[PDB]
Amino acid sequence: TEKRINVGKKHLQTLRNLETRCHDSLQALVVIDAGSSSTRTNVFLAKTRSCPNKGRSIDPDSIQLIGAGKRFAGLRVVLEEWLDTYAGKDWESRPVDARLLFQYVPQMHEGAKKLMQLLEEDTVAILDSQLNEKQKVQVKALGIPVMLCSTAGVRDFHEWYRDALFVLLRHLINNPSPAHGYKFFTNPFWTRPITGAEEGLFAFITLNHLSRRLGEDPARSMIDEYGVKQSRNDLAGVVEVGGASAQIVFPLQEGTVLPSSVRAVNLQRERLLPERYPSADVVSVSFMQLGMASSAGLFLKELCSNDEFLQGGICSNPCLFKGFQQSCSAGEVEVRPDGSASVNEDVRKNRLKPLATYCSVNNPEISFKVTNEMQCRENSIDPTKPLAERMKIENCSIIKGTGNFDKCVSQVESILVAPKLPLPANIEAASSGFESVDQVFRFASSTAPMIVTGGGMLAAINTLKDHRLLRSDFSGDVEELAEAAREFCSSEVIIRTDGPVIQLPNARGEQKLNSLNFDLCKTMALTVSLLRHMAAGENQPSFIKWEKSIAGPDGKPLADLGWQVGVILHHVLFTEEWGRNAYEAGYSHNL
Amino acid sequence: VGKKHLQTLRNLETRCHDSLQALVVIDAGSSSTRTNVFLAKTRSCPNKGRSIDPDSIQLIGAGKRFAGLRVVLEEWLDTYAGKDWESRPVDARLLFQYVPQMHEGAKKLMQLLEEDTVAILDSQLNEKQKVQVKALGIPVMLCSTAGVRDFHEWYRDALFVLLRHLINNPSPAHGYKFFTNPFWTRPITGAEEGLFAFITLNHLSRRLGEDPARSMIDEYGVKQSRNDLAGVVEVGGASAQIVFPLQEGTVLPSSVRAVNLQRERLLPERYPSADVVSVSFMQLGMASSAGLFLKELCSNDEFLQGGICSNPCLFKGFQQSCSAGEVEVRPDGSASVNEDVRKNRLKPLATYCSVNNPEISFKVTNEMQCRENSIDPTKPLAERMKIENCSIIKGTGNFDKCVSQVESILVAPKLPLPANIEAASSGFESVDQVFRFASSTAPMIVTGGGMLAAINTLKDHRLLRSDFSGDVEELAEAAREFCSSEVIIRTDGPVIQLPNARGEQKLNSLNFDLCKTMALTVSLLRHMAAGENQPSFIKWEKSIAGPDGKPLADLGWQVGVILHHVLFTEEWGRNAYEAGYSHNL
Amino acid sequence: ALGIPVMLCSTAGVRDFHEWYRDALFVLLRHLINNPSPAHGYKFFTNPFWTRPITGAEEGLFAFITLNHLSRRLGEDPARSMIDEYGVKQSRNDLAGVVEVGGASAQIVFPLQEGTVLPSSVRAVNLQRERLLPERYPSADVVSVSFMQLGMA
C-alpha cells in the first residue's frame, strides 16, 4: 500500500474544492399578508448560494411555501379598536381632531404589539414544525427577512394613522423574542403598504414565475437578432378577487398604441424586475369595493334602495336562491343548521363597515373633495348621516331571493362593473386611466392568456363543474358559463332534517347551503360580466383558466398564487441591492 | 412627546448604525507565531450595506509568541521524513500520506492562538461590546513572512490549506465567530510585506487618506496627497524591507519594476496613487544576518587566525564559543552558546542550501549563492552550519571595520544573498542597488526593535542628539565611541564600560552584538545619501501617536493587510458580511 | 465614427533593452499614435494600458487566449461552458496549451489540470485572480514562461 498517498492527494483537492467553490445554504423568508379579511403569515424557504468574491444570492426557482399561517385580526381592527378607545366611541360620525391622537402613539404600539406577538409565535410554530435540526441551524444563522404588506383592507384608511402604524410594526418585527433563535428583521422597503397596482403586478409575477413562463435563462428566454431579451412563452395575465379589492393585470402585446391617459407600467423602467429579465409593458389596475366582502355589502345597499327591487319592505334579490330569505342588512350572514339565515348586527362584522367608514363627512377625503362625496352618495351612502344610518338599508325588513341569474348579471353590471360614477376610494385606478372594470378592456386589451384567481371565483366555477353543468375542460366560453349559472341559480332552497339544501332544477341533484355558497351566484354574475367585457376587447385573451396553485416541476405546487411570491421576487431578484440589505446590513443592523 | 416618539423611531430606521467589529491578524513571522487583535467601527446604512471606518482601526492586544510555522513543519518532517532530512534525498511524494498528521501538529499551534486571542478579547471588551463583536463575526488574517518564505517543496501551501480549515472551525464555547478564506490567510510576498508596512505607516501618521483633510483633487482631476507619503525600512527577524514612493515622473530603468498602488490593487481608486519601490531581502533580518555574518566573517583569513576569530562588531573583552548558535549572556559574564540545531541562527539558511532541495539541486546559480556565503550544499547540515577551524570568537570592537564587513557581506555582496529571487526580479540583487537604481525625496522612517535599540542606546548615553535627524557621520561617530567600549565583569554581572569615563550599561543577550546593527544602519544611510534623490528626512519610530495622543496600533504590516482588504468596500462587504462565518456550514 | 483603438506592444526584441530608453520611447510612441493625420479620417488613439511593453508571460498568456478563443475552446456561453453542481463555471472542452517560437524568444504556456500541487517556487498564473479574463469566463491556473535567446534568430 502506497495508496495511503493517493488518499492524501485527494484530501488536499477535497479541501481545495471546498474553499474555491460556492456553498449552498437554506434561508427562511416571511411574507405577512395584512389583507382586508385578516393578518396572516406565509413562511417560505429558499436556497441561497455564496461564492468566493461574489457574495450571496437566492435561487429564485427554489422559493417554496412551507406554511400558511392562522388568520388573525386585520390591521383595520387594530386601528379602529385604537380609535374607539382614544378618539371615543363612534368617531365615525363626529369631527375628530387628528392632531390629538398623537399623544396616544404609545398605546397604538401596545395594541399592535398584541397582534405581532401572535404572528411571531405563529411563524415560529410553522418553522419549528417544518424544519429538521440541520435545516434549523442554517435558517437561524442567515437571518429571516420579513415582508409585511397591507392591501385593500387599510388602503382607504384616513388621516396619518396607517403609516404611523407601519413605523411601529417595523420596530416590532425588528425586536423578535430572543428565546426561539430565529432572527427576524425588516426595513421600510420590505414592510409597507402596497399599492393596488403593485398588488396586481406581484400577483402577475408570481403566476408567471410558478408556471415557469418568466425567467432569465435560455429555457425561458431568447435574445433576439436585435439584442432584446424575449420570453419564449407568452406571459399570462391575472385576475385576483380578494376580500375588499380585485386586481386585473395583463401584459400588452408589443407595440400596442395606448391612449395618452392609459398609464401602463414597464417592468424594467419601473424597477419591478431587473434588467436581465425580459421586459413588458403591463396594465395593472385594482378596484376597491370589488372584493367578495366589499362587493357583497355595496351590492345589497344599491340593489335594495332601488325601486325595481324594494317594494313595501321586501327586497327581491336576483342573486339569491328562491326560498332563501334573510334580514335586511349588510351584516355578516350565518346560515344556521335549522336553515334560517342569521345576520350579525355588530357593526364591525358588517360588510359595509369599510365603505361606510371611508364615506364619513368627517373624513377630509370627503369633507374637502366633493367628487368623493358624489361617489359615496351614488352608492347610497350619505356622508352626513351617522354610521349606523349610513349602513342601514332604508325601508327594508327582509331580503327574499328570486333566483334570476340574468337580472343578477345586469345588476352586477350597472352597480359594480360599469357604474355611473367610479366606486369610492379608487383614485389610484382612475389615475391609471381606469374608473370602472368596464373601461379596462375598452381602453387596453391583450391577447395574453388570463388566469382567474381567488377563493370565491374558483368556488363559482367548481360548483358548476361539480354538478356537471360545466365541462371539466371549461375553456372560458361566456355563453356556456351563463347557461350553467342560469340553471344553477334557478335552484330552490329546501329545508330538510339534515339542514338547508340547494335543490337543482330537473331533478339534477343537490348540495348543502352554507355561509360561503349562499350568494355565490353573485360571483357567477361578476365572472360572466367580466368575461363579456374581455370578449368585447379589441384583442381577446388567447385562453382563460381558473387556478389556485401551479404544479411545481416535482408535480406538487411550490407555493400559492397571490402577491406573496411576487414581492419576494421583486426584492431578491436585484441581487446586489438584496445582498446589501439582507446579508450585509441583515439583522445585525438592529443593535 | 408622541410627535417626537415617532420621529425618534423614524430617524432610527432611516439612518446608519454603528457597531463594533473584531479583526485578527496572526503574524506567522520567522521568530514566532502571534496574534494581533484589532477593533474597528462598522457602519451599516439603508440600501448601502456595511463597511469599516478605517481611521477607527485600533490594536487592543498583541498576543504571546508561540512556535513559528517553520518549527511546526520541520517537526513534522523530523517524524515523518526521518531525522536529518536536511542532509539526504527525501522523496516528497511520500509525505502526502502524512497530511493528516501535519494537520494534527498544526492543530496544536492553532488551539494556543485561538485561546490566546479569546483571552485578549474577553479581557479587553465590556459586556455590551462583546455582544456586537460576537454577532458580526471576526475576520482572521494569518500571513506567513520570511520565516517560511524560503521553505521547499509543497509543504508550506499544504499547511496553509489546513490552517484555514482550522481557523474556520473555532470552538463554539466562547462564542466569537472566527473565519477566514484564501485571500486573507496566505503567505505574503516580500514586496507585500513591504507595501502593507508602508500603508500602515502613512495611515497611522494620517498622511494617507481619501478625504479633503489628506487629499486634494488637482486642476486636472487627479487626486494628490496633501502631505508627502513616507517610505519605510523594517528589519525583522529573517528579512528587511525597504519601501518608498517615487517622486512623480521618475524615469526608471526598464529592469526596475515599481508597483503602482491602484494598478496593482493595493488601494482602491478613490485613494491617491503612487508608484512605489518595495523590495524585501532574505538574510537581512536580525537573526538571519547574525548567523550569516559570523559564517562569512569567521571563514575569512583577515579575521580567523589559528582558531581565533576577531570580530570588529563585538566589544573588546567579550568572547564566545565559535558557532551561530543562540547566545545567552549568563549572569557570571560568560557567553553560553546553544548547540541545539533548531536554535542555531544559521538553521534557516543552511536548510535552504541543501543539495537535496530542488531549488539548489537544479539551479546552479542558487548553489553558487550558497557557496559564496560559505554554505556548501553537498555537506550534511551540522557541517554546513559549522564554522570551520574556529574555536572561539573574540571581540575587537572596531566599528569602521565592522561597517566595511557589513558592507561587503550583507549590504553589497558579490552575489545576491540566497533565497532572494523576488528582490532580484524587481531589479534589485542587493541593498546596495536599491538606491543606485531608484531613489526618492520621500522621507524615510526606520522601524524594527533592533534598529531602534541601536539609536536609543547611543541616545541614552548622550552620544547622539535627542533631536537626531539622520546625519550619517554623526551616527558613525557615536557608534565608533560606543563600540570601543570594554566589557568588564563585576559582581553585578557583565558590564559595557564606555571610553573617556563616559558611563556604562549591563551587557545582555540582546545588546551584545548591537554594534552590527549600528553598522547596518550606517551602511544603509550611506547608500541612501548617495542616491540621486535623497530623502527629505529620516526618523526612527516604534508606533505613531494617535489623534488622542496615545498610539492606535503598532507599525508593521498588520494594519496594512487589514486596510488592503477592508478598503475595497464592495468586495469586503461581500466577503466579510454576506458570506461571513455562515459560509462555514 | 467609432474611433480605432491601437495596441502597440513590444516583445523580446527590446525586452532586454538597457537603461530608461525603452520606456521613454513608449511615451513618445503613444503621443505619436494619439496625433494621427486628420486627412484620412480614421481616428486612431491609445493609452498607457493598451500601448506598452508586454512581459514574456503576457506574451505567452495572450497567445494562449488567442488559441483557445479561435478554436472555440474558451468562451462564457453554454456552448463552451458548464456551471457545475457547485456553482463553478467549467470549460466544456479542455483548454489547450501553446508553444510559440518567435524571432528572439519562445513561449511555453499550458493550463494545469485542476488541483495540481506545485512546488512553492513555481509561480503559476490564475486567469481571474490576475485579471487576464473577466470573472464570468472559466478559470484556470496556467503556467506561462518565456525564454530569451530561444527564438529563431
Ligand SMILES: Nc1ncnc2c1ncn2[C@@H]1O[C@H](COP(=O)(O)OP(=O)(O)NP(=O)(O)O)[C@@H](O)[C@H]1O
Ligand atoms: N370558497 C369560497 N367561497 C366563497 N367565498 C370565499 C371562498 N373562499 C374565500 N371566500 C371569501 O373571499 C375572501 C378571501 O379573499 P382574501 O384574499 O383572503 O382576502 P384579503 O386578502 O384579506 N383582502 P385584499 O385586501 O383584497 O387582499 C374572504 O372575504 C372570504 O369571505
Ligand SMILES: Nc1ncnc2c1ncn2[C@@H]1O[C@H](COP(=O)(O)OP(=O)(O)NP(=O)(O)O)[C@@H](O)[C@H]1O
Ligand atoms: N531591542 C532589541 N534589541 C536587539 N534585538 C531585538 C530587539 N527587539 C527584537 N530584537 C530581535 O529582532 C527580531 C524581532 O523582529 P520580529 O519582527 O519580531 O521577527 P519576525 O516578524 O518573526 N520575522 P519576519 O518574517 O522578518 O517578519 C527578533 O529576532 C529579536 O531577536
Ligand SMILES: [Mg+2]
Ligand atoms: Mg389579498
Ligand SMILES: [Mg+2]
Ligand atoms: Mg515581521
Ligand SMILES: [Mg+2]
Ligand atoms: Mg512574436
